Write a protein that binds this ligand. Structure first.
Ligand SMILES: [Au+]
Ligand SMILES: [Au+]
Length: 452
């Protein structure tokens, strides 16, 4: 009694604790990476460290060459924080899905992506490192006397739900030198290691962000919001820290990147993610089908395959907002299906067929003469902030709500029974359910996911 957390005083307001215990905090402003903690550690950016969209602005993109790195030179006042005392490392991480091929080829090649490690004699290294090995995420802590402690996290086999499978995920690693190290992903505890009794950790004066010892020349990773705390955060501090970055400003695609205009997306319903969207016929309705899947018992990985089903495109309802291409919640849009190299608008015909005069059946490319076709939508995010999904609100042409886009299981004509896309206001009265049929993933083609 005894506490190796840095002293704050403020033991109440979580936000005050998070702020006060921050000793390093990378931000990207006007395309320059710097430390905004207040300790002013210097940050050197090498020529092939690239910038990409991030969870809230831009983020760091590392490729596999020696010019692709970011080095933080620790300020003198924070230099020895982890020698004996507690600390927390946090950052957003995006790693592409490893191919079956590359798991076999490179699966035993452990490579670092962030490190303070130092080499000392006796063969001894000292510091901490974040590294990857196949679909393992690994935290290593080493003291100056040769002790080594580690957490090895094995990712989920279902790569649609896995953390090292091309989505932005939030990492947090807490170190309490009087108990354990704990690894969290998206605020949830994934692994722990006891770390008591360690000696002095004598690490590098620099913290290096770079792929180290990676044998796959085409490998890359992205890192955002890299931050270090002089405290071992508790689960409630971690939850607030995690949710604090979920900016309400832009909507997000399936991978966590900002949603964009003029971009092909495949839709998948969150509440039935094994399904793809199909079209009966131009001018007619859409429905769900089962996605085909990939399975590999040898390598223990599997996943519903992506990029089957219709391609959708979002356009501004009222053109020319020049430079920006990002969709903001509350934006008014037109939804198209691109088919036969033609774009076909999505909407509901006045008095069109509906189920129980209340679930409105959507039509693609409808064009009956003299029949209004309602197609003005609002792209919104009403629920589940941790989930990268979107809702779509359809209006008539008089500001009345025709409902959120969803599905309805039923039959049209003598067709087979199907989950058919619809707009319904029924969803507004149920926005608090765990799972809801109006939640959609927007999935664009991405080099970080190829089907095997
Ligand atoms: Au690699
Ligand atoms: Au919903």
């Amino acid at each position: 009694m005894k506490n190796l957390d840095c002293w704050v005083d403020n033991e109440e307001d979580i936000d005050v604790i998070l702020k006060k215990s921050t000793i390093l905090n990378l931000d990207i402003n006007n395309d320059i990476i710097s430390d905004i903690s207040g300790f002013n550690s210097s940050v050197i950016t090498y020529p092939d460290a690239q910038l990409v969209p991030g969870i809230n602005g831009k983020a760091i993109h590392l490729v596999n060459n020696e010019s692709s790195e970011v080095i933080v030179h620790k300020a003198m006042d924070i230099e020895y924080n982890d020698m004996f005392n507690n600390f927390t490392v946090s950052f957003w991480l995006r790693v592409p899905k490893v191919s079956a091929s590359h798991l076999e080829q490179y699966g035993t090649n452990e490579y670092s992506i962030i490190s303070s490690m130092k080499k000392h004699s006796l063969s001894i290294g000292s510091g901490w490192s974040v590294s990857l090995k196949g679909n393992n995420l690994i935290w290593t802590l080493k003291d100056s006397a040769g002790e080594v402690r580690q957490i090895t996290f094995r990712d989920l086999p279902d790569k649609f739900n896995a953390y090292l499978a091309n989505k932005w995920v939030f990492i947090t690693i807490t170190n309490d030198r009087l108990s354990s190290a704990n690894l969290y992903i998206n605020g949830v505890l994934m692994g722990s290691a006891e770390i008591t009794g360690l000696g002095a950790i004598r690490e590098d004066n620099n913290i290096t962000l770079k792929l180290d010892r990676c044998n796959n020349n085409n490998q890359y990773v992205s890192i955002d919001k890299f931050r270090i705390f002089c405290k071992a955060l508790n689960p409630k501090e971690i939850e607030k820290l995690y949710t604090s970055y979920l900016s309400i400003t832009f909507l997000r695609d399936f991978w966590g990147n900002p949603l964009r205009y003029d971009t092909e997306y495949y839709l998948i319903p969150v509440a039935s993610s094994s399904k793809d969207v199909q079209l009966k016929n131009i001018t007619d309705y859409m429905y769900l089908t089962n996605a085909p899947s990939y399975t590999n018992g040898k390598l223990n990985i599997y996943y519903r395959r992506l990029y089957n089903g219709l391609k959708f495109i979002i356009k501004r309802y009222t053109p020319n907002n020049e430079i920006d291409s990002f969709v903001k919640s509350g934006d008014f849009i037109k939804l198209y299906v691109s088919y036969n190299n033609n774009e076909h608008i999505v909407g509901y015909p006045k008095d069109g067929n509906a189920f129980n005069n209340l679930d409105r059946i959507l039509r693609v490319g409808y064009n009956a003469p003299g029949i209004p076709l309602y197609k003005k939508m609002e792209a919104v995010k009403l629920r589940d902030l941790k989930t990268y999904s979107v809702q779509l609100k359809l209006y008539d042409d008089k500001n009345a709500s025709l409902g959120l886009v969803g599905t309805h299981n039923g039959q049209i004509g003598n067709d087979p029974n199907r989950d058919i896309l619809i707009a319904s206001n029924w969803y507004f009265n149920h926005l608090k359910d765990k799972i809801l049929g109006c939640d959609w993933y927007f999935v664009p083609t991405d080099e970080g996911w190829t089907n095997d």
